[PDB]
Assembly symmetry: none
Homo-oligomer: 308 residues x 4
């Protein structure tokens, strides 16, 4: 378990070249070598001695408040920088034709994966994408198919779908933020700059937003459907306080355990003739993008259905 | 607009503002803060971070010596500059203009330091049509300066050597250059400019610090070296030679480091501001000029140190 | 085939051969010489040069310490390699193969030094499809090694820092790396390979020395550092820290330099040659492998130091 | 006079950060700062202290023997290197289409300048160049026009033209070598590698051979015609010894003075709205090539006639 999740209130610190979490009930040492990223969901006291240490090991920290609302990320000083790649990233944005191809690829990845999850024909939508030259249009089309899938999510779950006013909306927002953060963490480990995107305007980490479009159906929608239909997540995993409905502590733990188990679940990847983790699919997707920006190979979005 | 934290302590949310404690307890109106830079050891918690996120205020962390460790980026911070930076690189014409500007600044300031007429070389710079050609002209003027450096000091230079420096002068130049690149990079990190995008030097780590330093090296390195040697503050006993390698010793580094820092802290009248600013601030002001240039606001003109006397 | 001049003296034409004098007077059959490398102070004249030109023999000049100064090139010397070098760079597939080879050599030798199983990472290297991806894997294994370096020495590392080194270990790594790049470059200049063309590192000064050094750094730097620290030859008194900068002092440099040179002079049995060669010669042998690779003769395989024990 | 010519037997050495030439009759100090290149035509004693000094100032040394025969050059360690440019130089050679364009441009530059000097129509030859795709053919065509011009050189001078067996052949060889050397010296000052060419095979400094093709008509043919017709060079400036005819000492000095005065003669250069030296035309030609290799501007060979 390379990703570390903190669900208890306490103090996180650097202790003898390792991490230490402590509160009134516990004091555990966590070898910083087995930690690649940290998600924080509780009240935590920390200091620069800790942050400078995490920065040194290249460990991003993601924060979520009482309501499970993602508030921000401690993004460490970059480990590896590539001026060439950076130029190419921006070049593919400045050139309308290059940017269009990428903007479309991300939308296609999103539609294809939503189609796999919701089993709704996307041919009509994919056709519009193939025929337009307007990025704003692509967005419009993607939002149209996304809307269709939300209407179906509501039917397949039986939960009402509309700041989350409903348990389902809470689940969607929580899963989406977890995905945005996880993707951001993967971008950090590469030479890619997280602010240069092609679908979404470059602001906010726009590249994470673009890439997450391809993965959200897998880490969010699909997981939510299974958790609700298999009765893993139910109405007792949510709370409504001051007209604020949110995934609570117990529910948050159920979802995170499911999210992390999915991240670590392996799947056969033809190109490597071996099974890779879902987390690795994100990494591999980033390297496919990099190779595209380097003009070495055309970028094709992950067609998750094809691996199943 | 920007809040700098230079002392160790604790930062937290108190009521609806920020509070710093350590001896001293100070409330800081958050309504004014756009960004917070931390240059000291700090204790904080999620209550503080979530509060900053709610206000859209990023929190930049640096260790005591200025080494950047990372930034807490709010979900929604209240990348245009980056695009503009690369834009002026991709457009060969825009790139060449900036590359020439840094060289012109280097030449103008070497002129002030060495007192070698730059009139003809500045015109030659204007005439070049590519970066390679531009560099050849810079190398020519640079050669005239190193020759004079040998004459005004009486020390051997012969040729610029860096791997490794073959004599005291090259050892001093390398040390001074390093201190200058670091100082400039430090100022860059205090702005929104990405340090990886340069125009004179090839971007392919922090190339922008190299470009901007061209304008300041004559003042922080050449000029200082000449002063220290002629005033007998740096002499032959401040160096150690191993085989073909010459190194500035401990005592030597301290002497130079101290003078460098004192120079950076020295103030000088800045007309446009109608007040005296330190030499470090001149770097910031130079970066501000580059930004306004990249933003299509006002054309970048290199610092003509001599104009400030 | 190649004649090396390592002692000071006079080189001239005598009858129809070469003659070196200084104490000693030696005639050198020119019929055997293809190239002449000079590593000492030499006196000569045009009669000698015209004679070498007539035979088509180039005369390469280096100062006593190995610094290349220039070459007397005959009108007709009796650039194919250069074309082949760039050819393997332009072909992304050929470049990637070479970049992976140097990384594999680095990993194999770090494995021998740190005793950390490289099996999985070597397979990951094989799977990468681009230089950026390849570098990420190298960085991963490198991280495991620096962690162990801290454990087997008890000294702080925390992270690789170079501008400037923030602690003794980084100061030693930077010094050792520098000595290694120089040593490798020196061997490159003794071959016909252009030092500017690399595959792992971006060509855009002497990038090839950087690539090839990846294979030797674990042996000449990491391994030596560990040995010197564990045997108490290099300790805390061999360093000086200024603010955030840590430097290896005079005594420290001498100790390390001496050990480095002694290591390079150490011999080890080389199976394919069925004899013992120095560690410096292993570099030359590695360059020979690269050349035969670039000439489409035999595929380049990095040096697996452990295989030599 | 940045170029230095040594026509007396002696010793050249470094003396107090300057150069010193000495023999039995003289001892002069030459500030190394005013020296950019040195051509040697007499017996000279030298050492590494001198060569390492010249290398430091980036001063190439060209050697010529008793017969005025160019024997070689001391090419110093490069002052400025550019890995990018080097890649681009070889790239334009490896790619048949890129190499063809350059191979043709050099031949065109040669034919156009020979045409200006000899006043012989080259349309027929230029047409063949424009229609072929064979570099060997280009050479064949260039050699054909070159042959025509030699036949005319013989008529316009009245000197017989054929190791130089005739005074005219001696002049041509001497001037050609001086040009090859001078061009090599200009290449040294740039980031260009002298061994990568497009017309001539990359060996020998093939790039100097290519570029010299464009300039030889100006520094050799044209100068020879004027020197002979104006009676500056005559039969007493040559010697025949052991069936070896060569430009002798007095003649060598007449030619070198003429060659150097031409190098320093200025000519109006529209693009700069000012007059530049002929030596600068060589430099400018190299930068035109560099800009072409960098994919910034198409390379067009110097049309000397156009500046007159």
């Amino acid at each position: 378990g390379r990703v570390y999740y903190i669900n208890s209130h306490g103090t996180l610190s650097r202790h003898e070249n390792t991490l230490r979490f402590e509160n009134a009930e516990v004091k555990k040492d966590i070898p910083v070598e087995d930690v690649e990223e940290i998600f924080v969901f509780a009240e935590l006291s920390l200091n620069t001695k800790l942050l400078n240490f995490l920065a040194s090991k290249g460990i991003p920290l993601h924060f979520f408040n009482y309501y499970g609302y993602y508030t921000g990320t401690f993004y460490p000083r970059e480990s590896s920088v590539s001026g060439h790649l950076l130029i190419k990233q921006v070049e593919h944005y400045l050139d309308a034709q290059k940017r269009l191809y990428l903007a479309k690829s991300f939308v296609i990845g999103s539609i294809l994966n939503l189609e796999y999850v919701y089993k709704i024909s996307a041919d009509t939508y994919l056709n519009k994408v193939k025929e337009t030259n307007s990025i704003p249009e692509l967005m419009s089309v993607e939002a149209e198919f996304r809307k269709l899938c939300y209407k179906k999510l509501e039917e397949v779950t039986g939960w009402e779908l509309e700041p989350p006013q409903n348990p389902l909306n809470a689940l969607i927002s929580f899963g989406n933020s977890l995905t945005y953060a996880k993707v951001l963490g993967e971008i950090y480990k590469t030479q890619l700059n997280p602010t240069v995107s092609y679908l979404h305007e470059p602001s906010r980490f726009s590249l994470s937003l673009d890439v997450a479009e391809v993965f959200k159906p897998i880490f969010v929608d699909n997981l939510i459907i299974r958790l609700i239909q298999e009765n893993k997540i139910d109405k007792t995993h949510f709370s409504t306080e001051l007209n604020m409905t949110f995934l609570n502590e117990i529910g948050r733990k159920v979802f995170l355990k499911a999210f992390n188990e999915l991240l670590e679940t392996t799947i056969f990847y033809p190109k490597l003739n071996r099974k890779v983790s879902h987390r690795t699919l994100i990494k591999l997707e980033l390297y496919k993008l990099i190779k595209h920006l380097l003009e070495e190979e055309v970028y094709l979005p992950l067609n998750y259905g094809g691996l199943k």
